Amino acid sequence: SFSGYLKLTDNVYIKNADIVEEAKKVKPTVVVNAANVYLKHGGGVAGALNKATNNAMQVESDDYIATNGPLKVGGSCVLSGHNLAKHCLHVVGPNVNKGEDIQLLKSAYENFNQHEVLLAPLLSAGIFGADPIHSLRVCVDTVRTNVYLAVFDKNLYDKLVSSFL
What is the C-alpha to C-alpha distance for residues 144 and 163, in angstroms, rounded to an integer? 21
Taking the CA atoms of 83, 81, 28 and 107 in sequence, report the sign of the dihedral they define. positive
Resolution of the experimentally solved model in angstroms: 1.1
Q: 83 φ, ψ to 5°?
A: -85, 5
Which among 76, 26, 97, 85 is positioned nearest to 57, based on CA atoms? 85
Taking the CA atoms of 48, 154, 7 and 164 in sequence, report the sign of the dihedral they define. negative
* Strand ordering across the sheet containing 87-91: 6-7, 12-16, 146-151, 117-120, 30-34, 87-91, 76-80
**C-alpha dist (Å) from residue 152 to 38, 75, 121:** 24, 23, 9
Pairing of strands 6-7, 30-34: unpaired
What is the C-alpha to C-alpha distance for residues 4 and 17, in angstroms, rounded to an integer? 10
Q: How many Å separate Cα 25 from the centre of its chain?
A: 17
What 3 state SS string does the chain have?
A: CCCCCEECCCCEEEEECCHHHHHHHHCCCEEEEECCCCCCCCCHHHHHHHHHCCCHHHHHHHHHHHHHCCCCCCCEEEEECCCCCCEEEEECCCCHHHCCCCCHHHHHHHHHHHCCEEEECCCCCHHHCCCHHHHHHHHHHHCCCEEEEEECCHHHHHHHHHCCC
The number of domains in the chain is: 1
Which among 46, 141, 59 is positioned nearest to 89, based on CA atoms? 46
Give the domain range for residue 29: 1-165
